Design a protein around this ligand. Structure first.
Ligand SMILES: Nc1nc2c(ncn2[C@@H]2O[C@H](COP(=O)(O)OP(=O)(O)OP(=O)(O)O)[C@@H](O)[C@H]2O)c(=O)[nH]1
Ligand SMILES: O=C([O-])C(=O)[O-]
Ligand SMILES: [Mn+2]
Ligand SMILES: [Mn+2]
Ligand SMILES: [Mn+2]
Length: 620
């Protein structure tokens, strides 16, 4: 078959067999093995023995530390230059720029970053040749969604990072069973490399292999390929999460007629024994995980978690909107997680959990800002910078974007249908972000078209999940600005087209704001478990209760319609105040934004909602 058998990497396989791979899987592995030149090839089987041996190797290489206070928990400290997503180095490659991003009017699009195929080939050939020299190439077969489910998509990731392999075992369904379900079927090609071939040219920091200078995360939807280079952080290296399940999946969803969204899925049950499922799209570090597994304060209410970050939704033959969580774990923000803000997350991360860039205590535990737990006498803290850290210092002991990686099955309130292949019926959709002023606590959209407009007009404060710093209010429509896989105008038209489906049970659409502050800078709403009071009103509105009052921005709860028992100290006037002067500026910014960023691809119905809202505000 060959003149020198130079394309036969079978001699470098330390686990598995190239003869046991499907045809297109073997070509994908051997092809990039020839390009990246790894010393070994490791075909993952997903077993606990492999996971155990993998952790031991990382512990011997100094990559991770063991947390002896907990059961099978591990800490990783990364290079300070590789701590979050880099939107400016995240690109999408299509033949036409207009397929990826709308051509702006004034210029420079904020709805994505497009790179031509010619430029990407130059960038690709300047990075990957010989990039895995002296390292092991791990072959990761993983399924997004329940295995064997016809509504699940299978991926193959190639990486030279054992930290990525362990995290993908938690975040996805990984192992040999995925290759058997795959067969000769298609798969998304995922190629990742830390970009530090051996011997090292540059000195390594915190044993974290990364190349910040050449960092690039590329998406090729026409070729169904994800190519990421130079970063170890989960958002850039766990390719089945943001890269596949959002960016690549959103384009596939548009083509096939479903939805891939940056949304949590929760099930809520009332004291009358009636349960409904809701979805909520909040921007990064805006409260999805806390809401998806909150501890309700109202007696007789129970909330169960289906997912906390990614939802795949599709209308069924009965007209219901069915959603699944394609993930297998929680990659949640660590700081702020305490027993009072998220006790269900505390119970989950007790075991089998990988932490990244959180502080370690001398007794083998974890620590971060907002953990709200005093330490015993004698217990010292080592910060995420691997330095002696004291409470009276300026630098935080944990990075603001530090994460835990925990299995979703360990969550105490995990929904008993979170792995159901048919999905859960969604009866409501929630938008919202961080607005310190103007936006009331909750309101309801007037129609489906107005609801789609509400998602498109979302604005929020910047967080630590990306590279955007400061307290500046940015646009983040549908909480998908960093994750749009294709033209946002076409994305809006795809959402609007759902109203044209036969017998489609369109969910109700709400908008919330947990973060409205007073004149002194403190929150008007306590939030966290108290958000069950807001969910109670949405539940009643879905049942058709006459609890709404019409406003120029939509329906708000009537007077005494919210349950405020126990919270008599809440100022309801400023919390639901709708100022005409504030909303005249708001429609001005939304108009200038949509006209510039969406331009000729703006659906008329979204334009009509903007015009109708501006008219209702002018009549105040
Ligand atoms: N004031 C207030 N802050 C909250 C509330 N819920 C969460 N937060 C804060 O917001 C931060 C973000 O929490 P998460 O739920 O992990 O954010 P997320 O929406 O899941 O973001 P990603 O996981 O990156 O997609 C937390 O550290 C909390 O401190 C709330 O109800 N009220
Ligand atoms: O990491 C995340 O989940 C994000 O950035 O939304
Ligand atoms: Mn997210
Ligand atoms: Mn989250
Ligand atoms: Mn229409």
């Amino acid at each position: 078959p060959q003149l020198h058998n130079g394309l036969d990497f079978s001699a470098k396989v330390i686990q598995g067999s190239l003869d046991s791979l499907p045809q297109e899987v073997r070509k994908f592995v051997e092809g990039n093995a020839q390009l990246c030149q790894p010393e070994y090839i490791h075909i993952c089987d997903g077993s606990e023995e492999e996971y155990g041996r993998l952790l031991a190797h990382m512990q011997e290489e100094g990559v991770i530390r063991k947390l002896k206070k907990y059961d099978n928990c591990w800490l990783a400290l990364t290079d300070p230059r590789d701590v979050a997503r880099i939107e400016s180095k995240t690109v999408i490659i299509t033949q036409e720029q207009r397929d990826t991003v709308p051509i702006p009017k004034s210029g420079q699009s904020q709805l994505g970053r497009w790179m031509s195929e010619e430029d990407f080939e130059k960038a690709f050939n300047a990075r990957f040749p010989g990039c895995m020299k002296g390292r092991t190439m791990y072959v990761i077969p993983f399924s997004m969604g329940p295995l064997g489910s016809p509504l699940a998509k299978i991926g193959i990731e190639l990486t030279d990072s054992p930290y990525v392999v362990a995290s993908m075992r938690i975040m996805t369904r990984m192992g040999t069973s995925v290759l058997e379900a795959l067969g000769d079927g298609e798969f998304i090609k995922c190629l990742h490399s830390v970009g530090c071939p051996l011997p090292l040219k540059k000195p390594l920091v915190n044993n974290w292999a990364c190349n910040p200078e050449l960092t690039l995360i590329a998406h090729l939807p026409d070729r169904r390929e994800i190519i990421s280079f130079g970063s170890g952080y989960g958002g850039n290296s766990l390719l089945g999460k943001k890269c596949f399940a959002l960016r690549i999946a959103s384009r596939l969803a548009k083509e096939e007629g479903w939805l891939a969204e940056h949304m949590l899925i929760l099930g809520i049950t009332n004291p009358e024994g009636k349960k409904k499922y809701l979805a909520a799209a909040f921007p990064s570090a805006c409260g999805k995980t806390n809401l998806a597994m909150m501890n309700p304060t109202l007696p007789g209410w129970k909330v169960e978690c289906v997912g906390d970050d990614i939802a795949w939704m599709k209308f069924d033959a009965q007209g219901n909107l069915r959603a699944i969580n394609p993930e297998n774990g929680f990659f949640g923000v660590a700081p702020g997680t305490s027993v009072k803000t998220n006790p269900n997350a505390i119970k989950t991360i007790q075991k089998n959990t990988i932490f990244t860039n959180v502080a370690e205590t001398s007794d083998g535990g974890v620590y971060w800002e907002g953990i709200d737990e005093p330490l015993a006498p004698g217990v010292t803290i080592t910060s995420w910078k691997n330095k002696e850290w004291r409470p009276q210092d300026e630098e935080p002991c944990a990075h603001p974007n530090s994460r835990f990686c925990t299995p979703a099955s360990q969550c105490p309130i995990i929904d008993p249908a979170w792995e159901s292949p048919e999905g859960v019926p969604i009866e409501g959709i929630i938008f919202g972000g961080r607005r310190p002023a103007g936006v009331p606590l909750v309101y309801e959209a007037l129609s489906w078209q107005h609801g789609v407009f509400v998602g498109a007009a979302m604005r929020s404060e910047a967080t630590a999940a990306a590279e955007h710093k400061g307290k500046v209010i940015m646009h983040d429509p549908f909480a998908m600005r960093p994750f749009f896989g294709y033209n946002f105008g076409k994305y809006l038209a795809h959402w609007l087209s759902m109203a044209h489906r036969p017998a489609a049970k369109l969910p109700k659409i709400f908008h919330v704001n947990w973060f409205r502050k007073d004149k002194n800078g403190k929150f008007l709403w306590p939030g966290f478990g108290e958000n069950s009071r807001v969910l109670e009103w949405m539940f009643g509105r879905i049942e058709g209760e006459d609890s709404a009052k019409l406003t120029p921005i939509g329906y708000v709860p009537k007077e005494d319609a919210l349950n405020l028992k126990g919270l008599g100290d809440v100022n309801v006037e400023e919390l639901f105040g709708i100022s005409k002067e504030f909303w005249e500026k708001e429609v001005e910014e939304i108009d200038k934004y949509l006209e510039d960023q969406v331009n000729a691809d703006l659906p008329y119905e979204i334009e009509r909602e903007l015009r109708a809202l501006k008219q209702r505000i002018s009549q105040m």
